[PDB]
């Protein structure tokens, strides 16, 4: 599924991501925009052989099991395929653990390079939330 901006903002709120670990909803929507372009089916192969999955491009190196990332962990205790669902619950639950890991949203390199310090409120501007 390809969400609209305000539609994803609403789904993220419903799933308790708004202000989670102090990151406003705009921070989560901006991250999703540049990670997946709001596409829940996005997959991208990393040079190390890990894969990134879903709206927030969660990496098989640490967080999900895809069966093909040697030496990896599965800290969200999920198949990486559950991160490709039109229902964002699994991606949200696993993003909550990632952002709690110590480096906040710097874990998403697209967030650090493209969202951090910007007017992230623009991402939720005019949304009925």
**Annotated binding residues for substrate, as ranges?**
101
Does 91 participate in binding Na ion (rule CB under 5 A)?
no
The one catalytic residue in 18, 52, 66, 119 is 52
HEC per residue, 40-69? CCCEEECCCCCEEECCCCEECCCCCECCCC
Query: Closest separation between CB of residue 80 and Na ion, Å?
Result: 7
| φ, ψ (nearest 5 deg) of residue 9 | -55, -45
Give the span between the Cα atoms of 101 and 11, in whole angstroms: 23
Report CA 119 to chain centroid distance, whole Å.
19
Region from 33-41, 71-79, 94-102, 108-116 binding Na ion, contact rule CB under 5 A: 71-79
Is 74 a binding residue for Na ion by CB under 5 A? The answer is yes
Q: Which of 106, 101, 98 is nearest to 63 (CA)?
A: 98
Q: Is 35 a catalytic residue?
A: yes
Q: Does 72 interact with Na ion (rule: CB under 5 A)? A: yes
7 catalytically annotated: no
Nearest residue (CB) to Na ion, 2 versus 66: 66
Cβ-count burial 83-105 (b if 16+ within 10 Å, e if not): bbeeebebbbbbbeebbeeeebb
Q: How far is the CB of 74 from Na ion (least distance, A)?
A: 5
From the CB of 8, what's the least distance to Na ion, in Å?
25
Q: Is 59 in the site for Na ion (CB under 5 A)?
A: no
Contact positions toward Na ion, by CB under 5 A? 60, 65, 69, 72, 74
Please identify every residue annotated as catalytic. 35, 52
């Amino acid at each position: 599924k390809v969400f609209g901006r305000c539609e994803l903002a609403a789904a993220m709120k419903r799933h308790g991501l708004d202000n989670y670990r102090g990151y406003s909803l705009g921070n989560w929507v901006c991250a999703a925009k540049f990670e997946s372009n709001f596409n829940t089916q996005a997959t991208n192969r990393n040079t190390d052989g890990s894969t990134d999955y879903g709206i927030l491009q969660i990496n098989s190196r640490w967080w999900c099991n895809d069966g093909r990332t040697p030496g990896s962990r599965n800290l969200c205790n999920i198949p990486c395929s559950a991160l490709l669902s039109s229902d964002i619950t699994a991606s949200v639950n696993c993003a909550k653990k990632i952002v709690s890991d110590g480096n906040g949203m710097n874990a998403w390199v697209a967030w650090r390079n493209r969202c951090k310090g910007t007017d992230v409120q623009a991402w939720i501007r005019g949304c009925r939330l």
